[PDB]
Every structure is written in C-alpha cells, then in structure tokens.
Amino acid sequence: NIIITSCVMAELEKLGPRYRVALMIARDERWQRLTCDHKGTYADDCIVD
Amino acid sequence: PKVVKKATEIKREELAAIKRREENERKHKRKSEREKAVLVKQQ
Amino acid sequence: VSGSYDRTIRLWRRDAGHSRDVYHTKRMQRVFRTMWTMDSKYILTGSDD
Amino acid sequence: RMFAKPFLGQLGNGHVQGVYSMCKDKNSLNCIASGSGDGVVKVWDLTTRDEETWRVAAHNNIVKGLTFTNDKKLLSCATDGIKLWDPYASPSNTTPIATWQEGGPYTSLSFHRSANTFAASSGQGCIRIWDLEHSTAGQAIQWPSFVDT
Amino acid sequence: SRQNPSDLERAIAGALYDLETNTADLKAALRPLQFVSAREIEVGHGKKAIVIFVPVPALQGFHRVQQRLTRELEKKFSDRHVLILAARRLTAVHDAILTDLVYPVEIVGKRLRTKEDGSKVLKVILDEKERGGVDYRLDTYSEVYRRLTGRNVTFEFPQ
Amino acid sequence: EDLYFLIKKAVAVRKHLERNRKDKDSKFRLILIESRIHRLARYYKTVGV
Amino acid sequence: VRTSVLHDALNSINNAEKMGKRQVMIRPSSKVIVKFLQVMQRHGYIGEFEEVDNGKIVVQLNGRLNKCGVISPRYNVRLAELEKWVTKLLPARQFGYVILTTSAGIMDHEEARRKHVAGKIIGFFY
RNA sequence: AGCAUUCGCCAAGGAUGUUUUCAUUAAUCAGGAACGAUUAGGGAUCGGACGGCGUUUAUUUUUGACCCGUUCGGCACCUUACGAUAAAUCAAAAUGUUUG
RNA sequence: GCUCGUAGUUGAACCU
Numbered sequence: 001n002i003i004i005t006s007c008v009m010a011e012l013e014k015l016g017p018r019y020r021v022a023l024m025i026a027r028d029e030r031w032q033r034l035t036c037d038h039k040g041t042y043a044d045d046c047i048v049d
Numbered sequence: 050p051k052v053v054k055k056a057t058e059i060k061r062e063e064l065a066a067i068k069r070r071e072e073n074e075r076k077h078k079r080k081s082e083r084e085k086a087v088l089v090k091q092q
Numbered sequence: 093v094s095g096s097y098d099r100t101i102r103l104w105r106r107d108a109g110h111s112r113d114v115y116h117t118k119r120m121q122r123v124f125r126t127m128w129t130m131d132s133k134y135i136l137t138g139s140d141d
Numbered sequence: 142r143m144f145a146k147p148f149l150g151q152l153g154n155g156h157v158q159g160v161y162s163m164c165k166d167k168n169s170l171n172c173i174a175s176g177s178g179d180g181v182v183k184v185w186d187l188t189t190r191d192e193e194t195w196r197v198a199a200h201n202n203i204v205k206g207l208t209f210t211n212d213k214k215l216l217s218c219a220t221d222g223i224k225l226w227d228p229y230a231s232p233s234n235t236t237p238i239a240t241w242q243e244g245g246p247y248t249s250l251s252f253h254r255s256a257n258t259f260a261a262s263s264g265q266g267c268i269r270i271w272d273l274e275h276s277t278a279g280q281a282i283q284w285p286s287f288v289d290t
Numbered sequence: 291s292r293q294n295p296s297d298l299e300r301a302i303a304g305a306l307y308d309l310e311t312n313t314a315d316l317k318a319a320l321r322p323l324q325f326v327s328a329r330e331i332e333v334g335h336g337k338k339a340i341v342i343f344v345p346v347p348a349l350q351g352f353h354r355v356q357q358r359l360t361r362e363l364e365k366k367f368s369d370r371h372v373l374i375l376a377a378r379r380l381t382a383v384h385d386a387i388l389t390d391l392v393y394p395v396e397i398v399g400k401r402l403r404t405k406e407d408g409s410k411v412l413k414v415i416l417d418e419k420e421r422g423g424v425d426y427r428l429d430t431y432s433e434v435y436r437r438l439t440g441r442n443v444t445f446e447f448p449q
Numbered sequence: 450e451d452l453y454f455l456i457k458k459a460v461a462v463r464k465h466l467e468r469n470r471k472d473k474d475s476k477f478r479l480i481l482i483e484s485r486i487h488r489l490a491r492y493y494k495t496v497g498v
Numbered sequence: 499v500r501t502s503v504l505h506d507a508l509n510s511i512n513n514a515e516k517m518g519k520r521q522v523m524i525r526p527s528s529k530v531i532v533k534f535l536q537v538m539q540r541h542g543y544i545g546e547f548e549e550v551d552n553g554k555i556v557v558q559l560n561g562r563l564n565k566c567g568v569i570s571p572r573y574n575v576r577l578a579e580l581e582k583w584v585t586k587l588l589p590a591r592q593f594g595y596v597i598l599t600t601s602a603g604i605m606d607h608e609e610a611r612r613k614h615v616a617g618k619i620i621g622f623f624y
Numbered sequence: 625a626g627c628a629u630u631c632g633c634c635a636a637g638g639a640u641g642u643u644u645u646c647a648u649u650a651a652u653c654a655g656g657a658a659c660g661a662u663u664a665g666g667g668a669u670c671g672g673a674c675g676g677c678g679u680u681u682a683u684u685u686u687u688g689a690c691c692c693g694u695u696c697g698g699c700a701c702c703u704u705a706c707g708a709u710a711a712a713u714c715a716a717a718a719u720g721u722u723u724g
Numbered sequence: 725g726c727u728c729g730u731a732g733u734u735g736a737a738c739c740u
C-alpha cells in the first residue's frame with residue numbers, strides 16, 4: 001500500500017501544469033491519502049519526522 | 050502573481066492604444082461604455 | 093464572485109466597477125466554478141487542479 | 142491588510158481531474174456536490190470536510206450540469222445524457238434512480254425554487270422542462286429557427 | 291417532352307400562356323418557354339409551396355427575368371411561395387441546388403458546426419443586402435432543401 | 450501564354466548583354482531566367498508539349 | 499515544404515493550448531483533422547468545432563489538453579502488440595488515447611479493441 | 625563583395641492592386657556552375673492601395689506636402705519567452721529532460 | 725563569402 005502525504009501532493013501541485021500528468025497519476029483514488037498536520041508543507045522533513 | 054500582473058499591464062497598454070486610435074479615428078454626444086455592450090435586441 | 097479562466101477569483105460588489113478583492117494560490121489552476129455558501133460569508137472554489 | 146488570511150481550506154482529498162461543475166443545496170447549507178472530468182461526482186458536507194459523504198463514477202466524459210432537487214436528490218448532465226441520483230439513501234445506491242437521453246447533448250442544467258421542476262440547456266438550442274414524478278419527456282422550448290449550442 | 295403534365299403543371303403552364311398574352315410589355319423568357327416540371331409540398335403545415343425545375347444550361351435564360359416574374363406568379367397563383375430549381379443527374383450538384391434555391395443573394399459561407407458528440411448541423415450565411423422577404427421565405431428554403439435533397443441545413447444572415 | 454513572355458524577356462536580356470557583355474550582375478539575371486527556361490521548359494515539356 | 503496539414507493544425511492546438519487561448523483558428527482543413535476532432539471531442543478534450551468555408555476550423559477548446567501527437571511514420575500495428583505501442587505512447591494507459599487508422603474508421607485504441615480491429619497509429623492525445 | 629552630383633539611354637528587379645490566365649507546375653539539396661506554428665503587442669520606419677466628423681497649394685477642380693484610420697510587405701529596437709537548450713545565441717539554437 | 729542547380733529526399737487537399 002503506497003501512502004502519499006499532503007506535503008507530497010502539495011509540492012506536486014505547487015509544481016505547475018507541466019506536471020499535470022504526474023499529479024493526475026499521483027491522485028489515484030486507490031491510495032492512502034496520509035493527512036499531515038504541520039505548518040511547513042515541506043516533504044523531506046515530513047517524511048523524516 | 051507574476052503572469053497576471055504582466056498580462057494586466059499588457060491589457061492596460063493595449064487598451065491605451067485602442068482608445069488612442071479610437072480618439073484619433075474619431076477626431077478625423079458620445080456612446081456610453083455601458084451602451085457599448087448591447088449589440089442588438091430582437092423582439 | 094467571478095471565477096476567471098486564469099488563476100483568480102474576483103470578489104466584487106453590486107455597484108463597484110472594480111474588484112473589491114482577488115484570490116489566488118500557486119496550487120489553484122483554472123477556476124471553472126465558484127459559488128457562495130448559503131450564509132454570505134464563505135466562497136467555494138472548484139478549479140482545474 | 143495584515144490579517145487578510147482568506148484561505149480556509151480544502152474539501153478533503155479532492156477529485157482526480159478538474160472540477161468542471163459544482164452545485165449547492167439552496168435549502169440546506171452544507172450539501173456540496175461537484176462533478177469532475179471523469180464523470181465521478183462526489184457529495185460533501187461542509188461540517189465534515191475531511192472526507193466526502195457520497196461518491197459515484199456517474200458519467201464517462203465529464204459532468205456538465207449538476208443540481209440538487211427540492212427533496213434531497215441530485216441531477217447531473219453530461220454528453221451521455223442526464224441522470225437523477227439519490228445521494229442520501231441508507232442503502233447507499235451507487236446505481237442511478239432515473240435517467241433521460243431523449244433530447245440531445247445536454248450541456249447544462251438548473252432547478253426550480255418551489256415546485257419540483259427543472260430545465261436543461263441542450264445542444265439543439267433548446268431548454269427542456271421536466272416536472273418531476275409525473276413527466277416522462279420534458280416539454281421543449283426553443284427560439285424558433287435557432288441552431289447554436 | 292419529358293413529362294405527361296399535371297393539371298397544376300398546366301396551371302403553371304397556363305400562367306405561362308397568360309404571360310404570353312394579356313400581359314406585359316416584356317417577353318424575353320415568356321415567349322419561348324414551355325412546360326418542364328413541378329412539385330408542391332407543405333412548409334410545415336398551413337400552406338404549401340410550389341417548385342419548378344430547370345433545363346440545366348438555360349439558367350441564364352431564366353436569369354433573363356425572375357424579378358417581378360415570381361411576383362406575378364405569386365399574385366396569379368395560389369398566394370404561396372414559388373421557387374425555381376435545377377434537376378440534374380453530388381457535391382457541387384447539391385451545392386448548386388442551394389445556390390439555385392437562394393438565387394438573388396449568393397451564399398457567403400457554409401458554417402457546418404458540431405456539438406459535443408458525433409452530431410453536426412450545417413448552417414450557411416447569406417449576405418445582408420436583401421432581407422425583407424428573405425426572412426419570411428428562409429424557413430421555406432431550408433425545409434424545401436431537406437424535403438427534396440435530403441440533408442439538414444439552416445440559413446443565416448451573419449453578425 | 451507565359452512562355453512567350455519568358456523567352457521575350459530572356460532573349461531581350463541576351464540582346465542587352467550582346468550590347469554590353471561586361472554587365473555581370475545582369476548576366477546573373479540572365480542565368481536566373483535561363484534557369485527558369487530549363488525549369489518550365491522541362492515541366493511543360495513533360496506535360497506533353 | 500510543410501505538406502503536413504495535421505502537423506501544422508496540431509502545432510496550433512498545442513501552442514495555442516499552452517498559451518491559454520480558448521479557441522484556435524485552423525484554416526488548412528482536412529477530413530483526417532475533422533475526424534480527429536470527432537474523436538477528441540467525443541472524449542471531451544476539445545470543446546466543440548465549427549468549419550466555415552472560404553476551410554476554417556474553429557475549435558472551442560476547454561483546457562485540460564496536455565499534448566496531441568505528431569507521428570509521421572504511420573506504422574501498421576498488430577492487435578497483440580497494440581498494448582506495447584499504447585504503453586509506449588501514453589504516459590499512463592488510463593489517461594489519453596491513441597488515434598488509430600483502421601478500416602472500420604478512425605477511433606481511439608479502446609474502441610478499436612471494442613470493434614476487434616488492428617490498424618495504424620497516426621496520433622496520440624492526452 | 626557592395627550602392628552616393630545632375631541628366632539621358634538600356635534592360636532587369638521589388639512592392640501594391642486587378643473584374644488576368646497552362647493549372648501542379650510545388651519544397652529541400654549529392655554531381656556542377658557565376659561573381660569576391662505563434663510569441664505580443666506598443667511606439668516609431670518607409671513602399672503601395674482605400675477612406676477623411678481637416679489646413680495649405682488655390683484665382684477653384686485637380687493634384688501634392690502635413691495629420692488620422694485600415695492594410696499589406698519588409699529592414700531593426702524593447703520587454704516576456706510560446707519556449708528552449710551546449711553556453712557565451714535568441715523572437716530563434718522555440719521544437720536534444722513525457723523526443724515521431 | 726553568397727546564389728542558381730541535379731541525382732536524391734519529402735510530394736497539397738477533394739472522390740460510397
């Protein structure tokens with residue numbers, strides 16, 4: 001089961017519509033949306049935390 | 050943001066030119082800018 | 093309220109002529125639908141992200 | 142200007158493709174439904190925004206029209222025609238409970254205030270009037286020699 | 291010639307003889323003309339429409355006079371729309387059928403649009419300079435063209 | 450048709466150079482129009498003429 | 499010389515989609531172009547079109563359109579290798595389509611396998 | 625490579641416009657030869673054609689110089705790149721990081 | 725230094 005934090009979908013959405021295919025493959029509704037609660041939306045510190 | 054700022058500046062300069070040649074091409078009452086919306090009205 | 097084809101919501105008044113406030117993010121792409129809630133306090137945004 | 146913080150948030154995990162039609166219940170305040178570009182419509186409650194109340198892959202291309210009826214039921218238009226859904230049923234029915242395709246490429250849809258009636262903006266330059274629970278085919282009203290969408 | 295003429299085809303030819311004697315003061319197309327062919331179908335419902343056909347290379351011979359000729363035909367016969375059309379024996383054939391339907395003002399542009407499925411509608415724009423009775427007869431031109439040739443077109447003055 | 454004005458123009462330029470054979474840029478205009486003689490003589494010979 | 503009316507028209511679709519325009523104007527028309535827009539319109543990636551002849555094609559487009567394809571060497575493709583070809587063209591097989599030239603018409607690859615026909619790859623769009 | 629007095633002659637050539645025609649003649653280059661799809665528009669530059677809610681030629685019609693609009697066709701500036709990418713090159717090296 | 729140019733290379737749409 002692959003898990004995709006809201007920092008990670010946040011950073012892919014901050015990357016522009018060049019990556020709309022990577023966003024549309026990243027929001028596969030099969031997958032566990034792991035909601036984070038911290039101010040940064042910074043994925044590397046969310047993952048190591 | 051940056052693209053909306055640039056593009057509304059471009060719309061300011063473009064409408065400045067279009068109103069400039071509108072006033073020259075007038076020069077060589079008016080019609081109100083709200084009346085320049087209704088093109089025609091069918092019964 | 094108007095949702096633009098580019099990345100912006102425009103908050104207007106009935107008798108204003110120019111925009112009372114404007115709304116944007118980096119993660120909001122092309123706002124196709126924007127509607128109010130049923131008290132007139134909040135505004136609700138469906139985009140192309 | 143210092144306390145201009147306009148952004149509350151986000152209706153959960155959102156859709157996959159872009160939200161191209163959404164609607165509100167004029168009698169409630171928290172029934173929010175939105176149909177993306179996969180046909181999949183979702184129904185949220187504004188109190189419980191971490192997840193959607195209801196979800197169905199309603200259509201194939203996109204969802205063009207979307208509205209709530211006066212009782213609790215919703216309606217969706219797409220190129221495949223128009224479907225009437227029950228989003229609030231205790232047996233949670235992923236299947237539709239009515240449909241219409243006699244008409245054309247229905248491209249939007251709007252619903253009456255008091256009485257159970259709605260109109261749809263078609264592709265034949267026409268609007269269709271349905272009065273629910275006692276109408277099979279809607280009455281057609283169009284401008285007489287009118288062609289455009 | 292080609293046809294065993296109808297009673298109303300010899301009512302039209304009888305109107306041609308009534309434009310051979312006891313008439314104008316003009317006969318350039320009225321003196322040589324005989325019977326050719328005619329059909330007569332409703333415009334929706336309420337009133338019918340009358341069409342005749344054309345021996346093919348003589349269309350400039352029917353450009354000898356058509357203005358006020360159709361006025362005399364609409365006065366003297368049945369108060370309905372009278373229309374000339376060239377029968378032949380498909381692309382420029384039926385495009386030529388359209389340009390023979392709307393004869394005074396030529397076609398400006400064919401606008402065949404589609405809807406958000408496989409559906410599509412043809413709608414050709416005609417020039418603005420004659421509108422007075424053309425907005426009346428334009429429904430008759432469209433429904434005559436689909437009742438005779440077979441496809442679905444609509445006509446419009448551009449904007 | 451066109452070919453007679455081509456050879457009128459070309460033989461006219463030839464007569465000009467026969468009046469002065471040291472005008473080498475008009476000699477380049479001659480090799481341009483002679484190249485058009487090879488061109489349209491070739492193609493309109495392969496039509497059948 | 500650019501004899502490729504399809505490559506020109508689809509450059510207009512691409513560049514005037516990244517531009518953020520909302521209808522394009524394609525004056526060099528075809529029937530491969532009109533049927534190509536029948537397919538993309540049927541899958542909703544372009545809004546609508548309208549051809550007004552002089553051969554103008556006016557395409558009211560929506561905005562999700564990422565990239566429409568430019569394959570010039572139009573190869574024959576087996577129905578058994580069509581999975582390999584579609585998984586090489588599309589960035590994800592459930593996103594976008596591959597325009598096939600078949601004897602039963604021109605349609606997407608999923609409908610081509612709904613009619614059990616193998617054809618020729620000309621396009622892709624996603 | 626180049627082109628600077630006036631005037632005449634000789635032919636070409638460009639651009640515009642037409643109510644002009646054989647109608648694929650088209651497009652790029654081994655072999656060879658002469659000379660040394662849009663950017664995104666704005667403000668200016670002329671070379672025409674059309675129009676004038678204007679002066680002056682003009683003793684008044686032509687007519688031309690000025691001013692304006694449309695319009696093509698080019699020689700360059702400026703920003704953003706529509707992007708790029710080998711960088712020093714860019715309205716093109718835009719199409720070599722989802723290559724057809 | 726640029727230009728014409730051949731083999732070659734790619735060859736407008738339109739017509740069950």
Ligand SMILES: [Zn+2]
Nearest residue numbers: 005007036046
């Ligand atoms: Zn986090």
